[PDB]
Design a protein around this ligand. Structure first.
Ligand SMILES: O=C(O)c1cc(F)c(Cl)nc1Cl
Length: 289
């Protein structure tokens, strides 16, 4: 697309911000607020429409895990509710295959989901698919070659370095090589033929390390680390470069946005969000209006 959208997040409470960053000129635009505040959500784009999935409204008047699917139209700058998932999913992971949205894992209270469901925009309907072999919240999700990957997270007792892959035509999950680092709440995306896992929380400290999985070789290799440690970060890809937005570094809710150029293997600070926050949903699509 053209703009990097960030939706929701957490700072003192769950947020409703929707803001769009333009890597071409460095400008931020504040757009229509989410109907419901929510942190720990995921963002994605299908057919030029932005989607906000799952999360949790941490608020003074209580805390409510979200099963909501909400759709934003850049042309109209308006949100509309879509069909809700079968179960609330806080700290969700999302991926898109063949125009379908896969919702992966997440928590509902003290329940840690292994279940997975798929949304078909043409029918505005969710359907459960095979569950993961492992319960995962704070799970990273990415799509490569029409295969879905769930990486890391937290199963209710242990934080995970494990990862698994979903084969749609077989409706089957299979474990892949584990990461070299335990990561919960990492930013997971795809660039070229590799699944990147950036940052996260390994049980003791927030991470700045970044490793990538090559599907051909089935191995994980560390690349350059990020300038700032961070968990609960937003991540996306824009014109062959990785962007990581916000997160929590153990001391502050970051406004820092870093950019990874895989050819030079370097991270640089490219902008700051209008305010620090963690647990945002991120996606890339067209320019509003
Ligand atoms: O285990 C954790 O401490 C953890 C950290 C995170 F940043 C997110 Cl998003 N989720 C979880 Cl579950």
């Amino acid at each position: 697309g053209r703009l990097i959208y960030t939706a929701g997040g957490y700072f003192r409470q769950s947020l409703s911000y929707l803001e769009a960053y333009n890597p071409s000129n460095g400008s931020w635009l504040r757009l229509a607020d989410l109907q419901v505040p929510r942190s720990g959500l995921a963002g994605c784009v299908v057919g030029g429409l932005l989607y906000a999935v799952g999360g949790r409204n941490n608020s003074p008047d209580g805390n409510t895990d979200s099963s909501a699917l909400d759709c934003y139209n850049p042309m109209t700058n308006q949100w509309s509710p879509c069909a809700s998932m079968s179960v609330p999913r806080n700290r969700i992971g999302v991926g898109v295959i063949d125009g379908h949205i896969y919702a992966v894992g997440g928590s509902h209270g003290c329940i840690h989901h292994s279940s997975v469901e798929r949304y078909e925009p043409e029918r505005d309907e969710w359907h459960l698919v095979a569950p993961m072999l492992t319960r995962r919240i704070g799970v990273g999700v990415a799509v490569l070659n029409r295969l879905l990957y769930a990486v890391g997270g937290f199963d209710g007792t242990n934080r995970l370095n494990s990862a698994e892959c979903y084969y749609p035509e077989r409706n089957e999950w299979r474990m892949i090589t584990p990461m070299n680092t335990i990561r919960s709440g990492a930013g997971v995306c795809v660039l070229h033929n590799c699944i990147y896992a950036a940052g996260g929380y390994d049980g003791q400290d927030q991470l700045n390390s970044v490793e990538r999985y090559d599907v051909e070789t089935e191995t994980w290799t560390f690349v350059a680390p990020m300038r700032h440690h961070r968990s609960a970060l937003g991540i996306t890809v824009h014109q062959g470069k990785i962007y990581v937005l916000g997160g929590y570094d153990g001391h502050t809710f970051l406004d820092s946005v870093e950019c990874y150029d895989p050819d030079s293997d370097t991270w640089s600070e490219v902008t700051r969000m209008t305010s620090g926050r963690s647990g945002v949903g991120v996606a890339v699509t067209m320019e509003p209006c």
